[PDB]
Amino acid sequence: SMYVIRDEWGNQIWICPGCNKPDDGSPMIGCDDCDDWYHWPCVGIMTAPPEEMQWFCPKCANK
């Protein structure tokens, strides 16, 4: 898969695999396996996890 787009300025824009919508500054969380980034509501995250806790997205969590 590939969830990073580039705009005409060369900047990288991450797309959330849960909703196929871009990062819009609202809180996201990064998967410590595949490194895709998700919107918190899209993965049921309601507040920042403990700093020490790794987080894995639904796809990887079943792997």
């Binding site: 500054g25 609202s26 969380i29 990064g30 918190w40 996890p49 700093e51 790794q54």
Partner: peptide
């Protein structure tokens, strides 16, 4: 975990 919020 790794989190961000930009706006």
């Amino acid at each position: 975990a790794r989190t961000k919020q930009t706006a």
